[PDB]
Amino acid sequence: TSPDTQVYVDIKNKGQPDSAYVNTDVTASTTQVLSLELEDVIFSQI
Amino acid sequence: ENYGLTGSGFNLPPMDDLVQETKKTFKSAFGEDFNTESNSVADKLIQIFNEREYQLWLLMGSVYYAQTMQGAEGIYLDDLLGKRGIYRLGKTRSTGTVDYELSSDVQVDVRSIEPGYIRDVHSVFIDGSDVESDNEYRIRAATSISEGKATRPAILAALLNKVEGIEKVRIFNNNTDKTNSLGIPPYRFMVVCYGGGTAEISQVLYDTIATSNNTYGDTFYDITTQVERIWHTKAAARQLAIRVRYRGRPLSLTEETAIANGLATAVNGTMIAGTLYNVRLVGTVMSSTSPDRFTQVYVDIKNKGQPDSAYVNTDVTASTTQVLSLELEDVIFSQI
Amino acid sequence: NYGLTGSGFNLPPMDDLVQETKKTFKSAFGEDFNTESNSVADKLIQIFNEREYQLWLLMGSVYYAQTMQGAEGIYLDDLLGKRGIYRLGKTRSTGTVVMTIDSSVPYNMIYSAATYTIDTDYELSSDVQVAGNIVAQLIKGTDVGTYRLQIQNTTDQSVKTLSLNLTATSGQPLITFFGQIKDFIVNNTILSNQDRIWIDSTEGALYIGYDTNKIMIGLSSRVDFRTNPMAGTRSISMDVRSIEPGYISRDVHSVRSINPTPGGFVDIDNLSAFIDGSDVESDNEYRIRAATSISEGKATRPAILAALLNKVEGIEKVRIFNNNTDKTNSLGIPPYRFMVVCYGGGTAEISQVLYDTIATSNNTYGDTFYDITTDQVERIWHTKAAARQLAIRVRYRGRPLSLTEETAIANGLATAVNGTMIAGTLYNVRLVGTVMSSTSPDTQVYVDIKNKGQPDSAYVNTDVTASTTQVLSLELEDVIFSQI
Amino acid sequence: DADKAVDQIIEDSKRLHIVVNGTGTEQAVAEDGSLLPSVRKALIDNLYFKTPPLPWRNGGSVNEFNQLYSFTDGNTTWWYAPGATVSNPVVMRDSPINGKFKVFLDKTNADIYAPLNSPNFVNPRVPTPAPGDNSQSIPTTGWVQSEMEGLED
Amino acid sequence: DADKAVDQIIEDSKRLHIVVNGTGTEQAVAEDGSLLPSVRKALIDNLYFKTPPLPWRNGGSVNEFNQLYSFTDVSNTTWWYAPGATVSNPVVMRDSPINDGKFKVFLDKTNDIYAPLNSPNFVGNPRVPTPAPNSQSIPTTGWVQSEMEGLED
Amino acid sequence: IALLSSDADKAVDQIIEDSKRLHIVVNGTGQAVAEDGSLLPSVRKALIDNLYFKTPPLPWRNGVNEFNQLYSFTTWWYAPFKVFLDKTNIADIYAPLNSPNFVGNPRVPTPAPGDNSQSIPTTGWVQSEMEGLED
Amino acid sequence: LKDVNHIHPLPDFVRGGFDYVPSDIFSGKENFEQTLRILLERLEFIDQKMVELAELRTTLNAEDAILDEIGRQLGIYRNGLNDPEYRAVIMILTGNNSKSGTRADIIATLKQLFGEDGVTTYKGYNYRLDINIFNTCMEVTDILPEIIDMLPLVTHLRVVENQGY
C-alpha cells in the first residue's frame, strides 16, 4: 500500500463464532497445511 | 490483447508463444496437412522472423521500465527527475572563516581554490561534496518548487530554497474570529522554523506574504522599503533514545547498522510537533532488511539521560516548539 | 548497440539490420544460401526489413516524449502541466481610439455600442457617452458674448463654474480670456497638464492637449469640460476590440475609417499600438513563457507597488498604509482595510490594475470608488492626494543675477516636486545645496518657504512636512529673488 | 433510466451479430425464452444447396456450409456439414458415417431411423419412470437399481 | 439540452429492442411513420410458407415465388412452385406442371421427430410389449417387478 | 454522467454492418461476406444454385448418365437406384422419439454391469443383476 | 495544415511494402501474398500498441493502475480517493505551483471542476469569502482539503453546494 496509524490482525478457523478471533500465532497440524480465500477477508475502521 | 500496457501493468509475451499463434494462423491459410515440425524448412523460416520481432517487445518493456521511478538508474535517473525541472549538483567548494582564497575584499570571507573535495581542522570549513549521488539525489527530489505567493505551499517552498541553513519548517493557521486552542490571535497565523538566521527569513517572508502583515510569533525584526516587522519562532529542543527487542537469528553487526541508520531517517523526517507511531517503527525494521528474520519485535523510546525504567512503547508526540531527533550511541539491540 | 544504452536512445540505419538478418539466414541454411538480388528470400527479407525501421523510429520518438526536450503537441502540455502552465487560446485585440467631433454635437448624446464598426474587423468595446471623455480641444478664430465654463474637480467631485465676457474677438482681450481659461483649467486636474496647453498669439488660437508642433497628444487623462457656447472642435477617446478572436495588429497611426459615419464626424486615428490578438499558442512561445515566469509576481506589497508604476499612463507617485488590529487607529481607517494613495493615475484604468490584490484582502478604502465586472461585479476604493503649493523666496549676497540666468535655479528647485506622500520633508539644507549646484561655482544664501497666499510674515526656515493625503507642489512663477 | 436503455442496445447488438453470422449448426437466444435461428440455418433449414455434387475424398477438407458431397462405397449418398466454414473447415475422413456430416434426405434415406417394429439400436436413453410403476413403460438402468435398493434392506 | 438527445435515444432503443425481439412478427413504427419489420418477419422469405398448398388449377396465376401449390396426377401428389413468380409478372396457371418448367416440385424436410437407430435420446413415455419372463429384449417396468416380485419371498 | 456511451459505439457500428448484410442478403441479386470470410448468397441467388430436377419423367428400362433426370416405372426414380415418389407415409412405420409405442421384439446393446444412469437395461442384464443380490 | 504530434498509427501500413513488389511478378499468385501478408500483419498489432504505450501514459487518460505511478513521482498519494477525482486532485495540486490566490485566479481553478456556470464566489469585508457550487459532478468532501490550500494565509471561507441555481 502507499505509505500511511494503527493496525491489528485477527485470525480464526472458518465457521467459528466471532469470539474465536485471537492474536497468538497458529501452527499447522501433522498433515495439515494453511489455506486462505480472497472472499474470506474483512475490514473494520476504528 | 493481453500484451502491452494494460493499466494493471505491462505484459511481455515469451519467445515460445509468439511462434504458436504465428504457426496457427499460418496453418489456417493452408490447412492442417502442412509440415511445420522441427527442422522443417518452413519452421526454420518462421523462427528467424519471430526472433527479430521478439526484440521489439523486449525493447518496449525496457523503455517502460527505464522510465519508472523504481527502475531509474544512472543517466536515466537524471532524465526522469529532470522532467521535474531539477538537476543533480556538481563539484562543490568549501567555505571557511578568517589551497584557499578570500571570498571577497575585507577591511577594518574564505573560499576554497580547488574545485571540489578537500587543511580542514580547528586551529591549524565544509568538506567533501564532489558528486551528488543518486540516493541523496532521490532525497533532494522530495522537495517542491513553485513561483506562487501568499499561499501555504508557496511560503514553505520559498523558505527551503532561499533561507540559508534552514532544515525544517511548519505553519499553523488560525483563520477564525476567536483565539484558537494554541492562543493565536484571531485572523493571524504563526510560522515556526528550525535553524536558519533571523534577519534573513524576515526578508524572505516579506517578499512572499500578502500585503497584510498577519504574522505572529515570539520574536520580531523590523524591515523597511515605510517600516513593519515580522514574527517567527524556533523550536529545536529534543533528542530521543531507542531500544529494540527481537527473537530469532542474531543480526551480526552489519545488519544492526542497516537497521539503525534506517530508523534514524524515519524518526528524523517527522514534522514539527508531529507524532511517532510504534507500528510505523516496526514496519521500517521489517523493510530495512529481508523478511523472515524475526518472529517478534518491540521498540522502546525514551529521552536521553532518563533511567532505563522510563522505556515506553506507546506512541510519542512533541510540543509546538519541539523537534524530534535521533543519533548514534543509541538503538540498543537485544535478544529476548 | 543502437537500442537502449547508458547515454539515451539511438537509431539504427537500414543496412545494419539487413546485414544482421542476412547473417541469421546464412547461419540457418549454411554459407551456401543466396541472399542477394535474385533470391526470392532476398525479396521477402528486404521488404520485411524496411517496416521495422519505421517501428524503431517511432519507438525512438516515443522515448523523448517524456523529457524536457523533444516533447511536442499534446505531450508537451503534460510535461509543463506539472508546473502549472497552460497554453493560451484564441485572443481578441484590444486598444483605444480617438475621434474629433463637430462643434454642434450635443454633450449628452450617447453612441450605441452595437451600431458601429471601426473598420472591417473592429467594433466599440462598450457604450460611450461624449460627456466625461474629452481628451483634447482646439479653439480658434470664430467664437462677442457671455460664456460659461464647467469642470469636474479631479480630486473632489464638486462641479466648478466660471463666468466671462468676450467683449472683443481678437487682440489682448482675447489673449487675456485664453489665459484666464488656462488658469481655470490648470487649478484642477494635474500640473503636468499646463505643460501641454498654450496660446499661439500669432494666430489667436488655443490648443488643448497638443505639442509645440501642433500634434494632438492628449491631456493627462479623460475629463469633463463644457462651454455653454459650444465653440471649437472637441476630441474624445473610445475603447475598441476586435470582432472575432484571432491574429490582427494595428500600428500607432493606422485606424482611418468608420463604416457608418455619424453626423458631425471629422476624423479618427490611433494614439499607440494595439495589443495585437493572437492565434492558438505555439510551442516556442509556450516554452519562452514557461522560462520567464520568475518575474511574474503578484499579491504582495512589493509586487503591487511595482505593478502600478508600470501599468498606468501616469501614476507619478504611490504609497500604501496598513491597519489590521481590531480598531480604526489614529488615521481614519476601518479595522481591516488597506489604504492606497496615488497621483495622476485616473480612476477606471488604475482600478483595473488593483485586481492583483490578494484574494480576500478587503482593501477597498478611500474617497473615490469604481465598479469592475469579474459574472459578478465588485467595487474598489482609493484616494488621490491633494496637492499643496509652496511659495519660496531666495536671498543672497553677491553679484546680481541676470535675467534668464535664474531659469537654472528655478528649474533646479524641481526637486521640491519629488517629495513623497506624507513622508515628505524639504530638508532646506538640500535646497541650499541644489541652488548652489545648478550654477557656475560662486557668498551667502538663504531659502524661505511658505504656503501660497500667506503674508510675507509666514516665511520661515524650518522644514515642512506633508499631511496625510497632501503632496508638495511648486510652480516656476512662484519663485522670487532678493539681493543683500 | 438511461443505463438500462444502453444495456438493451448492447444486448440487442450482440444478439443481432450472432444471428447474422451464426454457424450453420447454431441458433441464437432471444430475450424471451424463444431461440432465434441463424441465416446459415434458415437457408439450409428449409432447403438449399449447390447443385453439382462433388466426389468424396479421404484427403479433402470442407469449408462451405451448403454443398453436397457424394460419398460412395455403388451405394451413393449425398452429405453436408452445416458447421463448415473457411474459418472452421472440416476434414473429409475415410467415411462420413463416423460427425458434423449429415446425409441428404430421400424417401429411402428413413433407412437409418428405428422402425416401429422390433428395431435394433446401437447408447439409447429414456426418461426415468417414477418408482413403483407397474406399467409397460420402459425402465432405466438407474431405475432398476433404485428399486433393487429397497430389496436389499 | 442533452436531455433532448437522451429522450430520442430512449425510445430509439425501445424501437430497436422490439425489432430484434419482435416475436414472430412485429411492426416497429419509425418517426417518419414508415414501418420496420422484425427480424423474424424478414426471415419469412427463407421460411417457404408451407401452409396447405393452394390446389392446382388451370387458369389463374401464381403471384408468390415461394408459395406452394398442390397437384394430383391421373394415378400421386406433388407440391409445385414457380421461383420466377413475381408481382407484375405472375406465372399463368396451366393444366399440369410436368411440362411447365416454370414450376418445380418440392419435398419435405422433417424426417427431427423420429429416433435415429443410433443412440436415440427418447422423451415422454415410451412403451414396449412386456417381454417373456428375456435376454436381449427391452424389459418393462412391470416386467422387472414381476420378475423380482417372486424373489423377495 | 451518461458517458458510458464510450462503449456503445462499438456495438452501434457493428449493428450497422449487420443491418447492411441483412439488407444485401434479403434484397440482393442473382452476395454477402460474414466476419468469418464465408459467403452468404442472397435469396434471389440461392433460388438458382439449388437442386432442380427435370420435371418430365422417363420410362424405366433398368439400363443411367444423370443424377437429375427422373424415371417412371410401374413411381418415380433417379440415380444418385433410389425411388423418389412412392405412395406410402413415413410417420406410420418410423417411431417418433417422443412417446413411442414399439411392437414385436425391440433390442438394445446390453449396458456395462453396475451402470446407474438413464441408459436402457436389457432383460438379460437385469436378470443377471438379480442373481448378485440373491447371493 | 498539419498536426505537430507525429505519434500516430501509420496510415495504410499494410498496402505499403506490398508496393515494393518489383513488377507485379508475384501479384495474383495467391501463394506468396498470403505468406507475406501473414508476416506483415503481425507488425500491424505491434505498430498499433506503440501509440498506447505513449498515449495512455499521459495524465489525462492514465488509468488508475498506472496513474498511481504518476502521482507517486509528485508525492500525491491515492489515500482513499477514487479514480475520477484522484485525477482532479493531481491537477489541482500541480496547478497550485504558479498561483497567487487572486479573485480572478481563484475563479480560474474552480472553473475546471464545475463547468462554466457551476460556480460563483461572494466576497466579504473582513476577510470573508464564499464559494457556491451548482453543477458538481464529484463528491466534494474529499476534494475540500485542497480547496483550502490555494487561498491566502488569512482567508475565512464558507462552502455551500447545491444542484442548479
Short mmCIF file of N, CA and C in Angstrom, two decimals, chain C residues 218-307:
data_model
loop_
_atom_site.label_atom_id
_atom_site.label_comp_id
_atom_site.label_asym_id
_atom_site.label_seq_id
_atom_site.Cartn_x
_atom_site.Cartn_y
_atom_site.Cartn_z
N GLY C 218 -2.97 64.68 -26.45
CA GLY C 218 -3.93 64.39 -25.41
C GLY C 218 -3.50 64.93 -24.05
N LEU C 219 -4.49 65.11 -23.18
CA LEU C 219 -4.25 65.56 -21.82
C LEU C 219 -3.75 64.38 -20.99
N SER C 220 -3.61 64.59 -19.69
CA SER C 220 -3.12 63.54 -18.80
C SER C 220 -4.16 62.46 -18.53
N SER C 221 -5.44 62.73 -18.78
CA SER C 221 -6.49 61.75 -18.53
C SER C 221 -7.80 62.30 -19.06
N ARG C 222 -8.75 61.39 -19.29
CA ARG C 222 -10.08 61.80 -19.70
C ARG C 222 -10.72 62.66 -18.61
N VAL C 223 -11.46 63.68 -19.04
CA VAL C 223 -12.10 64.64 -18.14
C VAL C 223 -13.44 65.05 -18.74
N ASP C 224 -14.17 65.87 -17.99
CA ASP C 224 -15.39 66.51 -18.48
C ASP C 224 -15.19 68.02 -18.45
N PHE C 225 -15.62 68.69 -19.51
CA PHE C 225 -15.47 70.13 -19.61
C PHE C 225 -16.43 70.63 -20.68
N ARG C 226 -17.05 71.78 -20.42
CA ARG C 226 -18.11 72.26 -21.29
C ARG C 226 -18.08 73.77 -21.38
N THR C 227 -18.59 74.29 -22.50
CA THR C 227 -18.81 75.71 -22.69
C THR C 227 -20.22 75.91 -23.25
N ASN C 228 -20.98 76.80 -22.62
CA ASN C 228 -22.38 76.96 -22.99
C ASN C 228 -22.46 77.34 -24.46
N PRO C 229 -21.69 78.33 -24.94
CA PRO C 229 -21.47 78.42 -26.39
C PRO C 229 -20.46 77.38 -26.83
N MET C 230 -20.93 76.33 -27.50
CA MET C 230 -20.08 75.19 -27.85
C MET C 230 -19.17 75.60 -29.00
N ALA C 231 -17.96 76.04 -28.66
CA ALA C 231 -17.01 76.55 -29.64
C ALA C 231 -15.89 75.54 -29.90
N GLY C 232 -15.16 75.78 -30.98
CA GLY C 232 -14.04 74.94 -31.34
C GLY C 232 -14.47 73.54 -31.75
N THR C 233 -13.50 72.63 -31.74
CA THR C 233 -13.72 71.23 -32.06
C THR C 233 -13.26 70.38 -30.89
N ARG C 234 -14.07 69.40 -30.51
CA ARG C 234 -13.78 68.53 -29.38
C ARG C 234 -13.27 67.17 -29.86
N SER C 235 -12.49 66.52 -28.99
CA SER C 235 -11.97 65.19 -29.25
C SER C 235 -12.28 64.29 -28.05
N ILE C 236 -12.58 63.03 -28.34
CA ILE C 236 -12.96 62.06 -27.33
C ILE C 236 -12.16 60.78 -27.53
N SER C 237 -12.14 59.94 -26.50
CA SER C 237 -11.41 58.69 -26.50
C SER C 237 -12.39 57.54 -26.38
N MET C 238 -12.26 56.55 -27.25
CA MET C 238 -13.10 55.36 -27.24
C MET C 238 -12.25 54.12 -27.03
N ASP C 239 -12.90 53.06 -26.55
CA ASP C 239 -12.28 51.76 -26.36
C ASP C 239 -12.80 50.80 -27.41
N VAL C 240 -11.89 50.08 -28.05
CA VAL C 240 -12.20 49.26 -29.22
C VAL C 240 -11.64 47.87 -29.02
N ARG C 241 -12.38 46.86 -29.49
CA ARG C 241 -11.92 45.49 -29.52
C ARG C 241 -12.30 44.87 -30.85
N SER C 242 -11.62 43.78 -31.20
CA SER C 242 -11.86 43.11 -32.46
C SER C 242 -13.14 42.29 -32.41
N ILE C 243 -13.68 42.00 -33.59
CA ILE C 243 -14.94 41.26 -33.67
C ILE C 243 -14.73 39.81 -33.26
N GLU C 244 -13.92 39.08 -34.02
CA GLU C 244 -13.69 37.67 -33.75
C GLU C 244 -12.26 37.44 -33.28
N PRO C 245 -12.03 36.48 -32.40
CA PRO C 245 -10.67 36.23 -31.92
C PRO C 245 -9.78 35.70 -33.03
N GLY C 246 -8.49 36.00 -32.91
CA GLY C 246 -7.53 35.59 -33.91
C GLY C 246 -6.29 36.45 -33.85
N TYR C 247 -5.62 36.54 -34.99
CA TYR C 247 -4.42 37.36 -35.12
C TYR C 247 -4.74 38.62 -35.92
N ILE C 248 -4.38 39.77 -35.36
CA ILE C 248 -4.56 41.05 -36.04
C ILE C 248 -3.75 42.09 -35.29
N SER C 249 -3.14 43.01 -36.03
CA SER C 249 -2.31 44.04 -35.44
C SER C 249 -2.53 45.36 -36.16
N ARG C 250 -2.40 46.45 -35.42
CA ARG C 250 -2.54 47.79 -35.97
C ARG C 250 -1.47 48.69 -35.38
N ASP C 251 -1.01 49.65 -36.17
CA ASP C 251 0.11 50.49 -35.80
C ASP C 251 -0.37 51.73 -35.04
N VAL C 252 0.56 52.66 -34.82
CA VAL C 252 0.32 53.83 -33.98
C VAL C 252 -0.59 54.83 -34.68
N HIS C 253 -0.62 54.79 -36.01
CA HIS C 253 -1.42 55.73 -36.80
C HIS C 253 -2.11 55.02 -37.95
N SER C 254 -2.74 53.88 -37.66
CA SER C 254 -3.31 53.04 -38.71
C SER C 254 -4.81 53.29 -38.91
N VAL C 255 -5.60 53.18 -37.84
CA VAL C 255 -7.05 53.26 -37.99
C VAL C 255 -7.41 54.57 -38.68
N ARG C 256 -8.28 54.48 -39.69
CA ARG C 256 -8.56 55.63 -40.54
C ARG C 256 -10.02 55.78 -40.95
N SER C 257 -10.94 54.95 -40.48
CA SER C 257 -12.29 54.98 -41.03
C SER C 257 -13.30 54.47 -40.02
N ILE C 258 -14.56 54.80 -40.28
CA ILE C 258 -15.72 54.20 -39.63
C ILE C 258 -16.77 53.97 -40.71
N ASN C 259 -17.34 52.77 -40.74
CA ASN C 259 -18.23 52.43 -41.85
C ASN C 259 -19.50 53.28 -41.77
N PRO C 260 -20.33 53.15 -40.72
CA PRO C 260 -21.46 54.07 -40.60
C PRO C 260 -21.02 55.41 -40.04
N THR C 261 -20.94 56.42 -40.89
CA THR C 261 -20.40 57.70 -40.46
C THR C 261 -21.42 58.44 -39.60
N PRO C 262 -21.09 58.78 -38.35
CA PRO C 262 -22.03 59.55 -37.53
C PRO C 262 -22.00 61.02 -37.90
N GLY C 263 -23.15 61.67 -37.79
CA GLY C 263 -23.22 63.09 -38.10
C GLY C 263 -22.26 63.89 -37.24
N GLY C 264 -21.60 64.87 -37.86
CA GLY C 264 -20.63 65.69 -37.17
C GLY C 264 -19.25 65.09 -37.09
N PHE C 265 -19.05 63.89 -37.63
CA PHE C 265 -17.74 63.25 -37.59
C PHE C 265 -16.72 64.08 -38.37
N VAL C 266 -15.48 64.07 -37.89
CA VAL C 266 -14.41 64.85 -38.51
C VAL C 266 -13.29 63.91 -38.94
N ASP C 267 -12.69 63.21 -37.99
CA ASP C 267 -11.57 62.32 -38.29
C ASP C 267 -11.42 61.33 -37.15
N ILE C 268 -10.53 60.35 -37.36
CA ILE C 268 -10.28 59.30 -36.39
C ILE C 268 -8.87 58.77 -36.63
N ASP C 269 -8.19 58.40 -35.55
CA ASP C 269 -6.81 57.94 -35.65
C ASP C 269 -6.41 57.27 -34.35
N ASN C 270 -5.24 56.63 -34.38
CA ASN C 270 -4.71 55.91 -33.23
C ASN C 270 -3.81 56.82 -32.40
N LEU C 271 -3.51 56.37 -31.18
CA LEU C 271 -2.55 57.03 -30.32
C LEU C 271 -1.36 56.15 -29.96
N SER C 272 -1.56 54.84 -29.90
CA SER C 272 -0.47 53.91 -29.60
C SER C 272 -0.83 52.56 -30.19
N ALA C 273 0.19 51.71 -30.32
CA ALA C 273 -0.02 50.40 -30.92
C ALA C 273 -1.01 49.58 -30.10
N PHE C 274 -1.88 48.86 -30.79
CA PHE C 274 -2.82 47.97 -30.12
C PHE C 274 -2.10 46.77 -29.53
N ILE C 275 -2.72 46.17 -28.53
CA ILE C 275 -2.28 44.88 -28.01
C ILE C 275 -2.80 43.83 -28.99
N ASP C 276 -1.94 43.41 -29.92
CA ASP C 276 -2.38 42.57 -31.02
C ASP C 276 -2.95 41.25 -30.51
N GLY C 277 -3.98 40.77 -31.20
CA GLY C 277 -4.52 39.46 -30.92
C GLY C 277 -3.63 38.36 -31.48
N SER C 278 -3.85 37.15 -30.99
CA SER C 278 -3.01 36.02 -31.35
C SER C 278 -3.86 34.81 -31.68
N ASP C 279 -3.31 33.94 -32.52
CA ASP C 279 -3.92 32.67 -32.85
C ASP C 279 -3.63 31.67 -31.73
N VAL C 280 -3.89 30.39 -31.97
CA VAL C 280 -3.59 29.38 -30.97
C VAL C 280 -2.11 29.46 -30.62
N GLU C 281 -1.82 29.36 -29.32
CA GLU C 281 -0.45 29.50 -28.85
C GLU C 281 0.41 28.37 -29.40
N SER C 282 1.62 28.71 -29.85
CA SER C 282 2.53 27.72 -30.39
C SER C 282 3.52 27.25 -29.33
N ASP C 283 4.25 26.19 -29.66
CA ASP C 283 5.18 25.59 -28.71
C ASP C 283 6.32 26.52 -28.32
N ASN C 284 6.89 27.26 -29.28
CA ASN C 284 8.07 28.06 -28.99
C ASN C 284 7.77 29.12 -27.94
N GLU C 285 6.73 29.93 -28.17
CA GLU C 285 6.38 30.94 -27.19
C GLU C 285 5.85 30.32 -25.91
N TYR C 286 5.30 29.11 -25.98
CA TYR C 286 4.92 28.41 -24.75
C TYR C 286 6.14 28.14 -23.88
N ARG C 287 7.20 27.61 -24.48
CA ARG C 287 8.43 27.40 -23.72
C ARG C 287 9.00 28.72 -23.23
N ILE C 288 8.96 29.75 -24.08
CA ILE C 288 9.50 31.05 -23.68
C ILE C 288 8.76 31.58 -22.46
N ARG C 289 7.43 31.52 -22.47
CA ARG C 289 6.65 31.95 -21.32
C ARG C 289 6.97 31.11 -20.10
N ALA C 290 7.11 29.79 -20.27
CA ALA C 290 7.50 28.94 -19.15
C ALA C 290 8.84 29.35 -18.57
N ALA C 291 9.75 29.86 -19.39
CA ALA C 291 11.08 30.24 -18.93
C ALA C 291 11.10 31.55 -18.16
N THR C 292 10.25 32.50 -18.53
CA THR C 292 10.28 33.84 -17.97
C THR C 292 9.27 34.05 -16.85
N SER C 293 8.75 32.97 -16.26
CA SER C 293 7.74 33.09 -15.21
C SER C 293 8.31 33.61 -13.90
N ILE C 294 9.64 33.73 -13.77
CA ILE C 294 10.23 34.12 -12.50
C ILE C 294 9.77 35.52 -12.10
N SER C 295 9.78 36.46 -13.04
CA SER C 295 9.42 37.84 -12.73
C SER C 295 7.93 38.02 -12.47
N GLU C 296 7.11 37.00 -12.74
CA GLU C 296 5.66 37.11 -12.58
C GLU C 296 5.33 37.05 -11.09
N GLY C 297 5.35 38.22 -10.46
CA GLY C 297 5.00 38.36 -9.05
C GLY C 297 3.68 39.09 -8.90
N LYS C 298 2.91 38.67 -7.90
CA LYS C 298 1.59 39.25 -7.66
C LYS C 298 1.21 39.07 -6.20
N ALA C 299 0.22 39.85 -5.77
CA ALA C 299 -0.41 39.66 -4.47
C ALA C 299 0.58 39.84 -3.33
N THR C 300 1.51 40.78 -3.49
CA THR C 300 2.45 41.12 -2.43
C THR C 300 2.72 42.62 -2.49
N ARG C 301 3.10 43.19 -1.35
CA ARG C 301 3.28 44.64 -1.29
C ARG C 301 4.32 45.12 -2.30
N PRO C 302 5.51 44.53 -2.39
CA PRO C 302 6.41 44.93 -3.48
C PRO C 302 5.82 44.70 -4.85
N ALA C 303 5.10 43.59 -5.04
CA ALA C 303 4.51 43.30 -6.34
C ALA C 303 3.46 44.34 -6.71
N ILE C 304 2.57 44.68 -5.78
CA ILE C 304 1.55 45.67 -6.09
C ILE C 304 2.19 47.04 -6.31
N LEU C 305 3.23 47.37 -5.54
CA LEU C 305 3.92 48.63 -5.78
C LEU C 305 4.51 48.69 -7.18
N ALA C 306 5.18 47.61 -7.60
CA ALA C 306 5.79 47.60 -8.93
C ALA C 306 4.73 47.64 -10.03
N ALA C 307 3.64 46.89 -9.86
CA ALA C 307 2.66 46.76 -10.93
C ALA C 307 2.03 48.11 -11.27
#
